Amino acid sequence: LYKGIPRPAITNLHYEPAWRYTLYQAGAHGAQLSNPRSPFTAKVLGDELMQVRDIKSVEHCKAWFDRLQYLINLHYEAVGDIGEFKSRHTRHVHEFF
């Protein structure tokens, strides 16, 4: 049992919670703003900067909808002739949707 080497002190770390540290925080390393939707980031950036931040996704969506109502207003009456040999197809609107 007690032959052969002394018991390594680091063993203590198992039985005593006092010695479990982490000297630093998760993102103190400079990554703090990674989570875009965390409360910490909402506190750091403030709201108007978050608006500025997501404006691009807003205009993505608006782009989808704008295309959709253009196609709807174009093909709404399903049968007409809108172009040279091209005529209205409800199927266009369908597939975009």
Interface positions with other proteins (CB under 8 A): 25-27, 29-40, 43-46, 48-49, 52-57, 59-60, 63, 66-67, 70, 84-86
State which residue, 2 or 61, has the beta carbon closest to other proteins. 61
Distance in Å, CB of 74 to other proteins, minimum: 8
State which residue, 32 or 90, has the beta carbon closest to other proteins. 32
- 20 contact partners, CB below 8 Å, separation of at least 6: 13
Taking phi first (over 0 means left), then psi (-120 to 50 degrees means alpha), and beta for anything else, what does residue 88 get?
beta
How far from 29 is each of 41, 63, 81, 87, CA to CA, in Å?
15, 38, 63, 61
Distance in Å, CB of 81 to other proteins, minimum: 10
Identify whether the C-beta of residue 42 lies closer than 8 Å to the C-beta of residue 51.
no
State which residue, 11 or 57, has the beta carbon closest to other proteins. 57
